[PDB]
Subunit: 467 residues, 4 copies
């Protein structure tokens, strides 16, 4: 009926210098790589790009950095993109951060005819207050700072006003597509490709398989054809796998993972951070079913897959190749972060560089030293879900991690419920710390020295660990 | 995995008096009838319900009107429900109107943890200014009124602020579901069941088929299981078809429909309002192939099916059984109105009760006389899309439906680009009418006494008609 | 500091397209000498914010003759035919603003407040938009007013009003020094305080110039820092519009005598022109109530004796007036802060139309009566109890008491009590409840003289003051 | 003679039940209703909440309510020289919630004017917007309660703070004169918050220093119309308490900073001088340069200290020092004063500093734990358009750098400073970093670099001139 097929070169030739783009992809999962190369071939300059990340060294959007085609990047996470981080530090790229769920919802809103919407994410963080270093000069100093966000009260609580994002073009990748533009994605490579296809004026879409109209069930289309302007069928290539993890000294981490595992309960939908939170899922009791949720868009997330099941389309938040359990369900990034922001998870476990007696949490940033970005961290804590920090008690140089107020910039305000460590377990109660447990026959006087705040120690049982 | 399956009675038993429900379904399509029947049996009352429509006489929400179990209703369209329309008019039930796209997004936001957002829909209409009668006394007069909505400028355009809808419960109906909650819908019976399922505190799902965890493909799940708390498998029953339409005197309607069908250009994505705009679908030139969009969750809407193809899950905005073309796509009601509100439709044609030189349209009500509701009309007119109204020139009394200013409540101000009558074609330019085409072949002589206003007229031509 | 200048020298900087703010209520406080100078050097396409547009051959009104005005932003036209004529003919653009909003927005422009919230004008055409701000040259609509934003604070809805900062500000005062301190007399203060704060270059005509040191620091009303240029025009008499002095078929009197029974001891009240003002007279018992005037006075007395008349002491209806002992003056921002803040105990108005809803229409008839909101919108949108004194029916038999307002509304759900010659209704829960009937006139005739149903279950007879 | 609202001191106070929110007039002790606060101490209300600029001073005004622990919470801009007030905060008896002085004034006007909320650029990007200034302690020194955040919103290019209107159960004011139907007149800088305080109260009570008949006050000279006043009190004549009776009868780096800053003045400037080093630069103005000094407590045309006979408690500056006034000076209330400041009508603001940054940030109201006094008028004075010129010593006690990369102390304002003036050097803030302009004596350039705190531009550098 309706045909939108083009060659790779012709579809890309409209993109003028100064063009704003929206690109799907979580790491390399769902990255339109074949189109990013053709953009590089044509030599467009001063590009402004809204994308979850910036691909990686020599892949997807990452490849556009090579001949300095990027003016600005609006992202949530840098990742292992050395060119990007270097060009930002050396004053070649302007880097503006924005939390992952907001970024997805701003794209959706800009496609939905919704100019602005409220969210509790990044409230009280440096992102709302502004001042994060968006651009450097060539020699060392700060050239530009991010502008602040508007705040407003609904109920008792404070929310940020996020503006809609509308781009000149949109680049998406899909597993399948028909001639009239109906895209069908696969695994967690869906992510931003759905809201990315909505926010763009001219959306172009590469497909790993082309099919005729009729060959796709109308009941299975994730991105309907009205959205797509141009479909492209590049030569088939293997998607880059960052961390090819498979199923086949310093383990105070194991002790935290065993206490952390007693936070789980039958019927919980949980999100686990990288490191110790993920470890705690290994120590779950016998018939206690819990569903792990990966923010790139899945529930029913399993351990590393057997060799025979490794797929670039099925990875976790840390870009590690993952499997999935029976009763699984895939969803886009706007839905994924609606699910999170909506408080639909029961337990969110997370590492931390610094955790305050407030309930505050620090990891996101260290100004001009660590510049990874917020990722999905600010969305995971600012929602109403129960948040449990799992971290060591002190830094390796003896300083407390658990403090009164955060010296470091904040991931979220008044969010943390429990703080599990190798020595102790506190609960936050009324913006003030309560010592609930301590480790095997170790003392209350010890932990008191190792943390940088006073706490309630009026009912201290001994810490239990799962087998 | 998890097993959330229960009896019909035990899943409904926690619903107390005064409860708030979100209810899935469009007309009878996706109406959880089996659960509304059970809600009738245990006789709960003072019920506030959020749903697109109120079902039908003796089917769905409809059955809860029989014992006066409903206090308030929040709907977009009354539809064909005499019990409900009567109960509103004689003071028994309360009835607040909500634009359909606002209603789906308000539920989504409530699920998403977004407290508020902006939409241009319903700005300037009584629903922003407040003052639609929401309840009557028993004898005749007014009792309550709609509280106004807040407004706010982005660019130089004014937007309504819509608050999130979080309900005590959520009742949905899906075609297939597994035991850990994941739902898969069929046809245009999806609609509100997605956003409804995200917004309830305790959501409950009737399913036409139960499967084991593993039988649903992760990449076909329309509602992830995390959102679902209870799943019931009622005794199999037929979905009620309102109008069983199939492909197998004095109607001026054709004359206007044949002129309107010349607005259908090639490659256009169009939306057609119920009644007169839908009957220009016959006269699309043989070469031209448009894509019809139905607001209940379909692009690529076909003609009426043959007797063998008739499916209750495939219906239009008018609740008539419908076929689908190759390369068609289904979607939920939140997405459908993100598509419309975002200006992704090329053409939008609607009926009128009154139309004006100001660009206005009044097509949703006449007080205490005919109260159907806005439905999707307030979204379809407020977006960017070119609005073409198709109405007979004068009314059933003889008065002119074209006027200087609208007597009836406004569906949207400044929205109408062209008005197409059997006598003439008008075009609005700078808030003023301009006659472009005239018919077979009553000179301006006749047309000027049939319009309720004076208009510019220089470049006059004849009115052509399609085959 | 010394900012004294010639009349011409101060005005000469005003280019075409300049935005002005101009003080004055009616003619009192209206800088006629400076406006006349703007006429002589003939600036084109001006935008002017002011309480009104002066009068035919006085104040801002003198600038309509050569069509030097593009856009007026006022609360009240008054007795200005040129302005009313030119608006309708399509020469002048006219955006209405409630008087209390216009002053506080000038105050806000001066005070560095970008916007503020106000219950005034909520639900009216001035919030929603749609008022004809400009006609074309044939009586067709050219421009509608842009809407105001809204927002809930607590339970109720408020309009967001934007600051107004102008290129120029023209003020008039009775006294001033060379460094720019100003002192006004009587109700001729009004908008001169807030107008003086919102201009970038603010020029002041003074009736008397004095040295620095001669004005008491404690009796300055507009501080000198707000003043850039001071001018001393040749002495001239302020135009008195209605030179009022104290030297049968009257339904109007009967309404006033019933209305006078609404007054209690210790009440501060605002009464509109006409019948509300005529009730003051029949106040029973030896003195007890304070009359407020929106142009900047509490303790408004009756008309003065023939030799104690004063141009600077005039009321909202432009009439000359006396003041009682313990009376106090204030500017137009303070005046409507006082009103908007519920500090009045009673507000009595007239009406063109009143509804069972609680609605009031008394300000505008589209393309027919070009009068404007004035204070009326601010008075009906605050907490204060709002009584309507009006004729029951129109001359010609149509009911003024109706179910819903056909005409444009001054306030939504604002009226508490309606008083007519036939009847007295109270508005309870958004509907009409009949409480009194005059004479020995039956409930049957009123039922057919008013155009809505109502409760008639505890109807006394209407009392009246002597 | 219409209304009579006169009432005895004892009979006016009795209505104030436990838990009552009061709004009290006065700046420091100027315009403090003392005689009323004593009668409140007598009858003895507990758990009061009080809105005022200050909290008086020890044993004077709101100060006298701290003795019997009668205050639950204070909403103030300045702690002032009030020790009992201060300790109770740190020991954790009273709740202390700061509010910028111009916002507090305008919030009380807003309440009385029926304006539910208004926007203002003051305190945006300060700890007062973001939340987390310590509002109450426990008995040991840990935080119990923190200040909740303010909302923000963009008008034009820049961000503004939403400020909610203040309405109190009672309002307490002090006036030089009042008639029987409530019209008040004020004297000197003792007007200040009394005007906006008298408008925001449900029941407002007003101590006159002189009662007069209706007619006696000129209607044109009324500062607070009688409609606002519900009761009036005529206590025994008492002395308004002068904190610093100032009159005109180390190495001194302070004078070198002042003499440089006086060269920033210019004919026709209206200028505000902050407490400390900025005020002392008025001494060293060149004879031809005519300036008008503005005191934030309600005055333009502030003079030097008066001669011994001319001193009066009602004429005081921001530092509570007794002060004279020149020809063409004009008094005004505090809502008007901060309307004047916030409106950018000042041509030069000068301020002291605890810490100033290369960014353009200033921190001059708080160091958590030790010096907790509140913004005063500072946050308003840096958030207007007006040119900020900071005057400070180059280091502090214990030799640390007062010019820094970024402020570790809680900031008064963001990107506000245009010029820093010190005894060693004068800097400029350009685009977001520092520019060395002048250096005193012929002092070494590579001495000041690591004595300063950060790197800077140093291309076009002359020697620093001082005033005669
Ligand atoms: S997302 C899909 C939602 N889209 C919408 O457009 C929803 C709102 N639209 C409607 O309700 C209908 O589509 C309307 C606009 C009523 C269709 O009008 P038509 O163009 O079909 O014109 P008809 O005259 O056939 O209208 C049907 C009934 O309406 C009565 N009616 C029309 N105009 C008037 C006036 N001016 N005054 C009184 N009644 C009017 C007709 O009598 C007719 O009644 P039936 O009972 O249906 O015969
Ligand atoms: C910040 C402020 C204290 C600067 O002080 P100043 O009066 O100019 O005089 P100095 O610079 O000598 O400093 C005064 C005191 O602060 C101390 N100080 C200076 N820098 C300091 C620092 N980094 N840490 C701690 N203390 C410091 C001084 O040692 C001195 O202490 P002392 O009074 O106990 O002897 C002063 O501007 C202030 O109090 N501001 C309050 C808000 C405001 O601006 N109000 C006026 C509005 S009109
Ligand atoms: Ca497109
Ligand atoms: Ca739940
Ligand atoms: Ca000026
Ligand atoms: Ca009062």
């Amino acid at each position: 009926g309706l045909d939108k097929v083009m060659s790779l070169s012709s579809a890309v030739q409209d993109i003028k210098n100064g063009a704003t783009l929206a690109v799907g992809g979580f790491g390399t999962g769902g990255m339109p790589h074949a189109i990013m190369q053709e953009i590089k071939k044509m030599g467009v300059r001063d590009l402004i790009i809204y994308s979850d990340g910036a691909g990686v060294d020599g892949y997807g959007i990452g490849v556009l950095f090579e001949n300095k085609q990027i003016n600005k990047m609006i992202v949530s996470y840098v990742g292992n993109n050395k060119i990007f981080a270097r060009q930002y530090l050396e004053g070649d790229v302007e880097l503006e951060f924005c939390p992952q769920g907001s970024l997805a919802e701003r794209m959706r809103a800009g496609g939905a005819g919704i100019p602005a919407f409220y969210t509790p994410t990044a409230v009280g963080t440096v992102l709302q207050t502004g001042g994060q270093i968006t651009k450097y000069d060539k020699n060392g100093g700060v050239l530009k700072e991010s502008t602040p966000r508007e705040t407003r009260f609904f109920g008792g609580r404070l929310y940020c006003l996020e503006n809609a994002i509308k781009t000149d073009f949109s680049i998406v990748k899909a597993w399948k597509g028909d001639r009239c533009g109906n895209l069908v994605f696969r695994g967690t490579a869906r992510n931003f490709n759905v809201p990315v296809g909505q926010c763009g004026q001219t959306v172009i879409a590469e497909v790993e398989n082309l099919v005729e109209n009729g060959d796709i069930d109308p009941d299975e289309v994730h991105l309907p054809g009205v959205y797509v302007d141009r479909v492209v069928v590049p030569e088939r290539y293997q998607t880059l796998i960052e961390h090819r993890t498979v199923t086949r000294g310093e383990e105070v981490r194991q002790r935290i993972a065993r206490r952390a595992a007693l936070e789980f309960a039958n019927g919980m939908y949980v999100n686990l951070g990288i490191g110790i939170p993920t470890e705690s899922s290994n120590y779950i009791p016998a018939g206690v079913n819990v569903v792990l949720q990966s923010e790139n868009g899945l529930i029913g997330m399993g351990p590393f897959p057997t060799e025979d099941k490794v797929d670039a389309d099925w990875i976790n938040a840390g870009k590690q190749t993952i499997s999935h359990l029976a009763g699984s369900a895939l969803f886009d990034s706007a839905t994924s972060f609606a699910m999170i922001r909506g408080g639909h998870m029961d337990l969110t476990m997370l590492g931390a560089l610094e955790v305050a007696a407030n309930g505050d949490l620090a990891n996101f940033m260290i100004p001009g030293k660590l510049v990874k970005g917020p990722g999905g961290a600010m969305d995971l804590v600012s929602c109403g879900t129960r948040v449990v920090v799992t971290t060591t008690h002190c830094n390796k140089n003896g300083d407390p991690k658990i403090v009164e107020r955060c010296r470091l910039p904040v991931t979220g305000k008044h969010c943390v419920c429990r703080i599990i460590t190798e020595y102790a377990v506190f609960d936050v109660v009324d913006g003030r710390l309560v010592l609930k447990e301590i480790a095997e026959d170790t003392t209350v006087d010890q932990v008191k020295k190792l943390t940088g705040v006073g706490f309630d120690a009026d009912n201290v049982i001994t810490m239990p660990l799962a087998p």
